[PDB]
Design an enzyme around this catalytic site. Structure first.
Site, mmCIF file in Angstrom:
data_model
loop_
_atom_site.group_PDB
_atom_site.id
_atom_site.type_symbol
_atom_site.label_atom_id
_atom_site.label_comp_id
_atom_site.label_asym_id
_atom_site.label_seq_id
_atom_site.Cartn_x
_atom_site.Cartn_y
_atom_site.Cartn_z
ATOM 1 N N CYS C 387 1.568 51.536 56.397
ATOM 2 C CA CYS C 387 3.062 51.508 56.632
ATOM 3 C C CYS C 387 3.631 51.449 58.135
ATOM 4 O O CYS C 387 3.633 50.139 58.600
ATOM 5 C CB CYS C 387 3.702 52.763 56.075
ATOM 6 S SG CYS C 387 5.584 52.966 56.204
ATOM 7 N N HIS C 503 1.832 52.837 50.848
ATOM 8 C CA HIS C 503 0.774 53.800 50.934
ATOM 9 C C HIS C 503 -0.321 53.565 49.939
ATOM 10 O O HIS C 503 -0.168 53.963 48.777
ATOM 11 C CB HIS C 503 1.358 55.285 50.896
ATOM 12 C CG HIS C 503 2.102 55.317 52.110
ATOM 13 N ND1 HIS C 503 1.663 56.387 52.953
ATOM 14 C CD2 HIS C 503 3.585 55.325 52.151
ATOM 15 C CE1 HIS C 503 2.700 56.428 53.882
ATOM 16 N NE2 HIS C 503 3.746 55.855 53.660
ATOM 17 N N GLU C 505 -3.164 55.224 49.576
ATOM 18 C CA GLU C 505 -3.760 56.414 49.275
ATOM 19 C C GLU C 505 -3.368 57.111 48.148
ATOM 20 O O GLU C 505 -3.852 57.732 47.362
ATOM 21 C CB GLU C 505 -3.685 57.388 50.356
ATOM 22 C CG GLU C 505 -2.305 57.788 51.156
ATOM 23 C CD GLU C 505 -1.941 56.673 52.050
ATOM 24 O OE1 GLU C 505 -2.221 55.520 52.241
ATOM 25 O OE2 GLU C 505 -1.027 56.953 52.649
HETATM 26 N N1 LIG Z 1 6.058 55.675 55.742
HETATM 27 C C1 LIG Z 1 5.916 55.365 56.913
HETATM 28 O O1 LIG Z 1 4.936 55.518 57.492
HETATM 29 C C2 LIG Z 1 7.239 55.146 57.824
HETATM 30 C C3 LIG Z 1 7.265 54.069 58.715
HETATM 31 C C4 LIG Z 1 8.556 53.825 59.444
HETATM 32 N N2 LIG Z 1 9.172 55.019 60.151
HETATM 33 C C5 LIG Z 1 9.794 53.350 58.084
HETATM 34 O O2 LIG Z 1 10.635 54.023 58.127
HETATM 35 O O3 LIG Z 1 9.665 52.181 57.950
#
Ligand SMILES: NC(=O)CC[C@H](N)C(=O)O
Ligand SMILES: CC(C)(C(=O)Nc1ccc(-c2cncc(C(F)(F)F)n2)cn1)c1csc(NS(=O)(=O)C2CC2)n1
Ligand SMILES: CC(C)(C(=O)Nc1ccc(-c2cncc(C(F)(F)F)n2)cn1)c1csc(NS(=O)(=O)C2CC2)n1
Ligand SMILES: CC(C)(C(=O)Nc1ccc(-c2cncc(C(F)(F)F)n2)cn1)c1csc(NS(=O)(=O)C2CC2)n1
Ligand SMILES: O=c1ccn([C@@H]2O[C@H](COP(=O)(O)OP(=O)(O)OP(=O)(O)O)[C@@H](O)[C@H]2O)c(=O)[nH]1
Ligand SMILES: O=c1ccn([C@@H]2O[C@H](COP(=O)(O)OP(=O)(O)OP(=O)(O)O)[C@@H](O)[C@H]2O)c(=O)[nH]1
Ligand SMILES: O=c1ccn([C@@H]2O[C@H](COP(=O)(O)OP(=O)(O)OP(=O)(O)O)[C@@H](O)[C@H]2O)c(=O)[nH]1
Ligand SMILES: NC(=O)CC[C@H](N)C(=O)O
Ligand SMILES: NC(=O)CC[C@H](N)C(=O)O
Ligand SMILES: [Mg+2]
Ligand SMILES: [Mg+2]
Ligand SMILES: [Mg+2]
Lengths: 533, 533, 533
Positions: C387, C503, C505
């Site tokens: 992310c 994500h 995971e």
């Molecule tokens: N889920 C995260 O790692 C957030 C990444 C970033 N702050 C966003 O809002 O895209």
């Protein structure tokens, strides 16, 4: 052996002991042998130490156990006679565990409330339930256990914790819990307020018991809406919510519970294998003509005494109007300090059709008893003296017939030159069932006692007629087996003037009033001379 | 800013809101500016959703807050006018915390009851206490907080936990706790039983509040022995144990508390710097001649209405006998199913000296209201129609004067060819304080309202007189500022026949009855034509 | 439909969610379809508002529900995928009842905790249990409900009261209660102290639930004496007292419960009709050779992330040693203030065999992430960016390959002339399961994803690669279905350097590690080029 635990909710005094006794007489009407246990959460070993204003009328058992009046309700609703240990207390159970600990019976383990006190309660309840207290030696089929006090009192917690275990020690078919609560109906609100019952059931379930029956002490009958609110918030079936409302006579309370279905409930719930109470109720509610007894007493403290007169009244087929007279108002000093108290007491005593001087202890008001007995001798009013009433009937006959104007007991005036009733202990108190012999046939009391040569009655006194002065004294028709102790006195040349040294009332049942209370009721309506004929 | 938390013990309904209001009027008699907060432990945001049988008579504030009747008791005992948020609820406070959480104001922390809800309660109590609800814009010196329900209910726990913190946030001189309990006196016992008060104080102390005053709701006055048992087991001084017994009039409850010393207690306890209520009580208890009002209603649901008539009665110097008539009994169908209900209702309605048709919702019993208004028109009985009573006075005049026999409102019969009262929302409900203009001088209502050109009154309705049919209709003397809405109707050629579209009763005080209720009372005793003269 | 309520005793954190998940995987090994519900007693609607230090690692469901990590334990122990409302909270349930009240659905009745909130909890539990969360659309046979917090907290009381009713709404064969407690073994004492478990069971029974199983969180195994003391004072059978002691791997906890007989218990107790976990445990405990991953993060907050690496490690047959690096220590300012923090962090990062930059929010430590990615590019260390790690891998390639040294996201530096990653909301957050398309065959990530043309993965971000600067940027092999959003980036001329915008995971299971975590583990041991071959 089945168990029913009756528990009290919001307050005491809400008829819980009458409910327990009614449940017992219902099960006895089902043909079951039934015993009962009262638990009093107090530290007192026996009620014999109490001033009769707190836990009033200490009831005396055959064995000499001085117990709470609820044990007498059990003996009146059920033809049983109980033992000391059918009154359980925290004093009796903690003393048991303490003495047992000092003897080493707990094998060097730390004694504590759970398990050791809670086990002791269960042991006691099982032991006393197996004792055939019934009129024939058959082993009981159900024990109605009444827990005194209210739930969630620190005193009641050991017993509720014991019963929380007990319902898993004996199986659920052998343990039922009834919760007797209050549903108040305030002037402030008009509604029947179930909230305190809901909170009390919630409290009881926090202590691990769930009501199988919720018996609401109502004044007026429950509304359907209030019963459904109770069933909801107490999380129990509508059929298992009962109202015990106000009723005319005691005789209706089993019938009300019967109507409310509790018999059918207990039979299924405990897997178990009263028309006289209709009769007695209907008979009571149609009594028109009234007798009147002056109860000239010091002290609910006359619970058994009142009940014995009401049995006698219902048997002769009259109402009873009891003129409660504080004996301390018949004293001449009350003519000095409060002439309104003095004259109202003598209006009551003179308008009475007969007079009853009940038992008691201490000087206070004894001179008012002596003046009430003087009235009853000389104006030929039917008289019953019970225990102290006999002792003071020998003091009064000594003062105003024999002219020994000093005379008293050694309890009040040990300095007296005529100690006509003396401290005469058992070689302790003369306490429990003793046998009295009738020394003759010439006794109206012997005729009322069915012309038996002896009777056996419950005594509770330390003092007796002096055998020296007896020779000058007032026919002592009843004596003990030793001839040491005078136990019935009957005066010649009077309609009915009796002193008994025992307590007749403790053996009165609705189906059989005690003969001196019956004789007093018969004499004060002029029917005695027909009855004896 | 000082705080007094009034808490309820054994039950609700035991006059706790009258005690809170009495404590407030006592402190106001000490010259203090006083505000009040009711906490209702329910999930409802506002009382406007309630059927008037549960938390009966939804009281309407200036802002349009539909709140519990206790907020109206505050406005009647104290010359204050309250805001919505002076009624706190769990719905209002949990919704606050939830919406605040969704906005992220709790900064990614886990929101939970302690601290976040208990803080929100304290924040709310502080905020609403600083609002000058009094008749002049002075900041309050004491807030009487009433906690509804009973202590140890799962609903009341957040608030008691909040107040447990609050007494350490503000200092002890700024926080007093009063516990209003019940001391029952059973028919079963004769004794005044303090046990439930002792248990309730013990419960309250388990939640961390200790009673500064224990106020016993008694029926009869407390005995000394019972007061000393309360003082003992509640672990508080005898002077801090109060009995609020049954009294003749509401006006005596501040005087009883005054006599019991609570004023002197609060002054020292909170470190702070009623002869009309003697007068009003004594005046009330010597009223001989009686008026009689027929209250022809559907639904305690008429709490403000009854109080407004009693203010009016005391002002004209008569007793009031309110003939509560179920409007569903005046329907002709009740002549079919239960002719005993039908004739008893018409005996009550005919023997009444005037008739009051109060507000309400739904069809049920509206035809009985219409027949009660028909009686009051044609037999020249003084009539007041309140809200729905005005709407149905326009239906009745339409049916039986104009001959539009079909006529009804669009609430009940939307299919009608003469929808003479129509659904007319605020461009929502017409709810709270609106200004009404008098369109003329020719009004008895204008004279009763002191000859003012306008009045401002609390409304709570969705429906209004149709402006089309108005031209054929029955003098609409009061209108809104837009001229869209008719808000007072007065009939020509009748003694007194009034419909008001608002609720006059919400602004009635003992010192100032609302003029249409006063005019009804004056007219039904023939005194109106003297008063207006 | 059968229910098992798992309740927590002395403390939280004692493995209750692992026990709940283990009970679920045991019942799933019995061939049952099993669902799960977590109750979190907090006022928060969803975990999406939390700072990852409190209830760390907000787990993201398919529907976009941001929930507690325990919902992820359910998805890992059981092949189920859950909905938002399988996380119940007080916020969700009070908001339900409040909105329902405002719509009038409670029919003008007073809403309160019992019944209305306790009904709402039961309604919710029944509704969510009937939802086929399992990998095929079959209706669940058992629901494991975990109650978060500890028993007798004011927050947990509504739910325990609901379950107290529920066990009488559904029959006892459909409701089991497990109590997960702590048995501490102090340094101060050496004994295993059962007292807090006894008190917690006593507390739970005061709230009306009795443990069917008492599961003791032990450190060391229970002694027989301690188990018999628990069985005694918790008033339950020895077979129903379980120790969950410390074990080597997570994989042993179902086996330990199996050995302790709970399967056989549930089968009889609920009347109902794991060798891989032996294998995985034994496989884990014999891993000799170790991989090492640098986890360069800000924030238990990496619970799913760590688990996904451990799945991957067990699959390649190595140990894992995770070098937890606070990203704020890799910033050059920490070389100024604390050169011991700065050099220990760079020893950890350089000795690591690959680096993982996980997701997160806010500026703090982002420059340390950018420097950790710079290290991983230029020293050819296997890199996974998750992310935020993808966004910062596009910032780092922009700064140090393209020479746009200013470059940042619009989250941190909106003033930047090269906003290479921009705020790009869903026309809200890109939250939950979205479909990503592979725009090519030339991807190692596509090969790891089984050569599928698309994948579907759980996203939770507001920001995306700018499509303007994309033309100059670093092969964006994965895109959304619109082509608007870049969702996988893979760098040419590096061993393995991947950014994923989702994500991975949250979809890792022991039996199937997520392919980028597997590819990172494979690459950092040099096995990837064999695996792809
Ligand atoms: N889920 C995260 O790692 C957030 C990444 C970033 N702050 C966003 O809002 O895209
Ligand atoms: C004194 C008298 C005449 C009597 O009727 N009293 C009376 C009347 C009504 C109630 C009563 C009213 N409502 C409710 C409840 C309760 F159940 F809730 F408590 N009680 C209680 N006692 C009487 C004669 S004989 C006796 N009692 S007795 O000898 O034991 C015999 C039964 C074996 N009492
Ligand atoms: C209806 C009427 C005539 C009345 O006297 N009722 C009455 C009488 C007595 C009690 C009472 C008896 N004992 C104890 C307690 C308590 F305190 F414990 F509750 N109360 C309660 N209400 C009335 C006129 S005006 C009004 N009320 S009012 O408009 O608010 C105004 C005061 C500001 N009521
Ligand atoms: C991190 C690791 C390697 C692991 O073994 N951890 C570990 C080890 C032991 C315990 C443990 C010890 N005693 C008692 C208890 C409890 F039960 F009381 F809590 N627990 C808890 N977690 C791991 C790999 S995979 C995973 N978890 S996981 O992906 O959900 C998969 C299961 C579905 N963890
Ligand atoms: O003053 C208020 C405000 C709010 N509430 C709230 O409304 C609910 C009404 O409940 P009650 O207190 O009337 O109790 P109940 O109906 O269960 O029992 P009885 O009346 O028969 O005694 C309470 O449980 C509380 O949550 C009040 O009772 N009173
Ligand atoms: O039936 C029995 C047996 C024993 N006890 C025991 O005697 C004590 C008497 O106490 P009460 O229950 O009479 O309470 P109280 O005097 O504090 O309050 P009220 O009467 O005014 O309601 C109780 O606290 C209990 O320990 C009974 O109350 N009743
Ligand atoms: O210091 C003292 C004095 C007395 N007691 C008394 O002895 C009893 C011993 O009981 P413990 O407190 O040792 O509790 P337990 O054996 O039920 O549980 P664990 O040790 O496994 O935690 C207690 O319940 C209390 O009544 C003490 O515990 N400690
Ligand atoms: N039972 C009684 O009435 C007691 C009488 C007297 N006090 C005695 O001890 O003999
Ligand atoms: N307040 C009332 O009496 C309501 C009257 C009518 N139902 C309306 O909504 O206008
Ligand atoms: Mg109620
Ligand atoms: Mg008492
Ligand atoms: Mg120990």
């Amino acid at each position: 052996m089945k168990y029913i635990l009756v528990t009290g909710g919001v307050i005491s005094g809400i008829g819980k002991g009458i409910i327990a006794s009614s449940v017992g007489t219902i099960l006895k009407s089902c043909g079951l042998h039934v015993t009962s246990i009262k638990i009093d959460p107090y530290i007192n070993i026996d009620a014999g130490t109490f001033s009769p204003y707190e836990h009033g009328e200490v009831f005396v058992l055959d064995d000499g156990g001085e117990v709470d009046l609820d044990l007498g309700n059990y003996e009146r609703f059920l033809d049983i006679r109980l033992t000391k240990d059918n009154n359980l207390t925290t004093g009796k159970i903690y003393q048991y565990v303490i003495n047992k600990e000092r003897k080493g019976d707990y094998l060097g383990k730390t004694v504590q409330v759970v398990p050791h006190i809670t086990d002791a309660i269960q042991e006691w309840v099982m032991r006393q339930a197996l004792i055939p207290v019934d009129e024939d030696g058959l082993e009981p089929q159900v024990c109605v256990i009444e827990l005194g006090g209210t739930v969630g009192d620190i005193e009641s917690m050991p017993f509720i914790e014991a019963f929380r275990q007990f319902q898993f020690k004996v199986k659920r078919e052998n343990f039922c819990n009834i919760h007797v609560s209050l549903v108040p109906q305030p002037s402030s609100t008009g509604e029947q307020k179930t909230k305190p019952t809901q909170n009390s059931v919630r409290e009881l379930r926090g202590l691990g018991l769930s009501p199988d029956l919720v018996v609401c002490r109502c004044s007026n009958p429950l509304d359907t809406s209030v019963k459904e609110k109770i069933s909801m918030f107490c999380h129990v079936e509508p059929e298992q919510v009962i109202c015990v409302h106000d009723v005319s006579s005691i005789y209706r309370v089993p019938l009300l519970l019967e109507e409310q279905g509790v018999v059918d409930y207990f039979l299924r719930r405990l897997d178990l294998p009263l028309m006289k109470w209709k009769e007695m109720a209907d008979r009571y509610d149609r009594l028109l003509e009234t007798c009147s007894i002056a109860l000239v007493g010091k002290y609910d403290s006359y619970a058994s005494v009142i009940k014995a007169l009401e049995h006698s009244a219902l048997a002769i087929n009259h109402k009873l109007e009891i003129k409660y007279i504080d004996s301390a108002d018949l004293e001449p000093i009350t003519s000095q300090e409060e002439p309104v108290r003095y004259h109202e007491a003598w209006q009551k005593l003179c308008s009475a059709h007969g007079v009853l001087v009940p038992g008691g202890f201490g000087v206070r008001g004894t001179e008012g008893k002596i003046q009430a007995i003087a009235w009853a001798r000389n104006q030929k009013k039917p008289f019953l003296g019970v225990c102290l009433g006999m002792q003071l009937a020998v003091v009064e006959f000594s003062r105003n017939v024999l002219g020994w104007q000093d005379a008293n007991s050694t309890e009040f005036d040990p300095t007296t030159s005529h100690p006509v009733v003396v401290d005469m202990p058992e070689h302790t108190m003369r306490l429990g069932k003793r046998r009295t012999l009738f020394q003759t046939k010439n006794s109206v009391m012997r005729k009322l006692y069915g012309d038996a040569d002896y009777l056996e009655e419950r005594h509770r006194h330390r003092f007796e007629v002096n055998p020296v002065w007896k020779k000058c004294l007032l026919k002592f028709v009843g004596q003990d087996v030793e001839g040491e102790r005078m136990e019935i006195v009957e005066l010649e040349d009077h309609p009915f003037f009796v002193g008994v040294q025992y307590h007749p009332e403790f053996l009165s049942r609705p189906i059989k009033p005690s003969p001196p209370y019956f004789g007093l009721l018969l004499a004060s309506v002029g029917r005695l001379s027909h009855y004896l004929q």
